[PDB]
Design a protein around this ligand. Sequence first.
Ligand SMILES: [Zn+2]
Ligand SMILES: [Zn+2]
Ligand SMILES: [Zn+2]
Ligand SMILES: [Zn+2]
Lengths: 724, 301
Amino acid sequence: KPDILWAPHHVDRFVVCDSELSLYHVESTSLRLSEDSAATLLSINSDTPYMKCVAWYLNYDPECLLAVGQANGRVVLTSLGQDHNSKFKDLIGKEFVPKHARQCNTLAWNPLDSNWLAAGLDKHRADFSVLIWDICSTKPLYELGQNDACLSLCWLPRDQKLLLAGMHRNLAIFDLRNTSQKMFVNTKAVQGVTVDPYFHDRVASFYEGQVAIWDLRKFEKPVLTLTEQPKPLTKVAWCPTRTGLLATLTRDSNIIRLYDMQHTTIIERSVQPCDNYIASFAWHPTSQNRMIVVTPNRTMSDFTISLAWSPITSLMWACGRHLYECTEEDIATKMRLRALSRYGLDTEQVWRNHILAGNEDPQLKSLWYTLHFMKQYTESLVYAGIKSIVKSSSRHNWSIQNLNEERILALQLCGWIKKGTDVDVGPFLNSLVQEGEWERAAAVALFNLDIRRAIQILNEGASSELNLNVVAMALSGYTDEKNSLWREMCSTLRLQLNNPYLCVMFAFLTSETGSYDGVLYENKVAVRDRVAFACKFLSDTQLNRYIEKLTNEMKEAGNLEGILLTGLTKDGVDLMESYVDRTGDVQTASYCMLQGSPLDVLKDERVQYWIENYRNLLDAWRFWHKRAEFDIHRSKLDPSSKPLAQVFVSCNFCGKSISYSKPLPRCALCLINMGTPAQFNNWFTWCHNCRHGGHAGHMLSWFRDHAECPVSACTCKCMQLDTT
Amino acid sequence: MFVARSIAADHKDLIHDVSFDFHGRRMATCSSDQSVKVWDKSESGDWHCTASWKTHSGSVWRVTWAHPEFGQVLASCSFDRTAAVWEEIVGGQSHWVKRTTLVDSRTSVTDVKFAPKHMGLMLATCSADGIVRIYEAPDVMNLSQWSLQHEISCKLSCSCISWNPSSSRAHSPMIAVGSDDAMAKVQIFEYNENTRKYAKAETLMTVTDPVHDIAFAPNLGRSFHILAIATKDVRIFTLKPVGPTKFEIHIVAQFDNHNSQVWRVSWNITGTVLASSGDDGCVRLWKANYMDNWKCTGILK
Ligand SMILES: [Zn+2]
Ligand SMILES: [Zn+2]
Ligand SMILES: [Zn+2]
Ligand SMILES: [Zn+2]
């Protein structure tokens, strides 16, 4: 049974036992034990072929000495290091043999003194198998085990004259003080003997697939029994650097069970150091919780926190005796920042809210945009949406009032048409011209059917900032022939365009009569522009179907733009829930639901729950003076959000003939009835616990100076109780 | 997008558990030395400890705090088959003095935690024998009185528990407990309003490996439910509600980057990111992508 051992004085020394012993020294990074570790062999020796037992010295001088006990019973003490000045050169290679032939299973060393040699061999004919020699610095130290087989033994660490004697089917408490004094207890587990170093009186055993541990003071029955294993155990050992930790290795087992015995249930942990079952592993006595396992392919495998969150988007971490903090190099942080700019508090200029959002987001920029037109439209059916409003040329004659009144209002809401019946896009035209989005203006004029005006616009744009001129040269080809080479070619070739407005315009110019199917199903263009084109071009049934399908798609997706067509309604509520699911931003949604919702809409359970969630979040952020701002807006917009009366002065004896408008207050520090003619300094405080009160300034000064209930013969701190 | 900054905190023994607070002014740390210490981050941010007490003869099993809405309350779990609730008393150094005890269960407590703050004072504990019991204090003003409202028999060794995290009126009572005793480990139990009894809803049949931690991320009033389970592999699953009410089940994600069992599952205040630390000595924090795709956006060592 090969096993891996380490030097008792050096931690960088690693050994693998076989028919040819290999000694290696660990160096930082030859065998690569780990990714950053390399082990270089010190020497190779095979002085003990077909060996059965081995041990190690109990003294630094000499070092690099390990037992070589072959099956013949001979005990050979060989040292592998560069021996030049050994403390006991006489013992180097000392040939010790037993009188009767036998095979030694396990060899252990006495810790307190190294001048003795104790080992157990096979059962003798009729004689004592357990004969221990004296190492010192031709006769043995002590012998026992008459006609008995000792599977294993070891000298106890607490007492130099203490060791364990195990019979064939029993364990005998052998005392070196008096060999005639021994106590034997019958047991089946006489193998895998392991003992905790911290718990010197605790012993353990490994017996095939069953492991039993018994206490020395109660060595009559096993204290507990380990789980039965199918594979036989390969090695049982106790980790010395970890309290209440034991390691059990099974033959042909790739996962090593590690039970936690520090409870007195035992917490068993399975460790797999490699994909191949390691024959044995060695725990580090100097390093903390370090174990090196030896794979059967001459591979040395070596194997060896608290986390939390924070309300300001921080993570706290811990490890052993160390702690760590994590911070961003976030939805919550973005919401907090949006709060930090006083976003959503605008009343005079709702247009400014999108800018107040700060970040570049078209959806939010669309979101506040839609209300801004809606805000002007108010100055209630407008909040219903495009759906409710919509519920109620074979050629292109390029060169307005014919639009329906509902269509006119829809276009006005979309931002294209200003107030009044003046159907003139010159306002939006000049606004776009100053805005710089020349392509959008060109598309709009094309929708407004001003071809040469669009030509002038594109030429002026080219006068600003090349490609635009050639695009316009293509634009000059507005031909409506059904057998068209120009339309046969450019209609396909337009796909190479980068800006999608030009491609949309080319498609519209080159599309068939009426069938503007690609017009609606364009997804990379602005929503309001598409809606306006559909309203100003499509047929009534066609427009209704297009609006319905677009609304369904927007509700299914959850895009902030869709609020404009959906409006503030139950469908608006569903869209808000969809957006919350998509992102989860509350503050934006919270104000959005507060954008003039009706009483029925404000009665939505989803809306109230979302507002309450935002309120709780705003409370947790500690932004003291800001939560009241949301409360104020809630009370202003809605009269159901009114606060309760809360405090109500009516108690004690009432009384009459003495009233303000006997007495209820008295100034404990001035004894003046309250209410007499820094305004906050003239109020009167009251004590929830101290059942007292007095002038606010007087109480403030006294509590600043004095630190007790100024209420006479009282002890309850009327203010130093919350400890803010 | 997280930068790790070590905190100048030294633990004499191995950390047994950690606790925090809604305001987060102070933090509670449990050590293997059978002692409980509380460290508070100062105004400058320096975390200093001013409390030190030994809870139970055994080592600490778990520890948690309560709502800042109800004064200062701390609860602890130990392997000594007992639960202690130390309360700081300031006279001005504070003095953590136990207000009551919870040692009804003959076995060691796997974990002890409190319920949502909406419905009142209620903290429960998970027993390793598949037992969980919740005690409700009749009066807040009295801190020494606490009577068990009910009990739950998991019939399988409980490892971690997690109750209903949503304060919604429609969100009825719900409790989820994991098992580390092949079978399902996470059982969602619900206290029916009409029956006034805690009844199971469903068992997470999709998981058969032993469960280490069971937690549900911050609700923020979503339209569904999100929770995490700690086992040999980290997975993300979603619960959408339709006796017990039916629900829709779908796994949001399952990332096993740690390549080992995770000791515990953690998250963020807004539920934006859930944090998991595997047995590999690494912490994996996953963030959903803009296409509703969870991605491990944090790596720790
Ligand atoms: Zn009166
Ligand atoms: Zn008072
Ligand atoms: Zn006064
Ligand atoms: Zn007083």
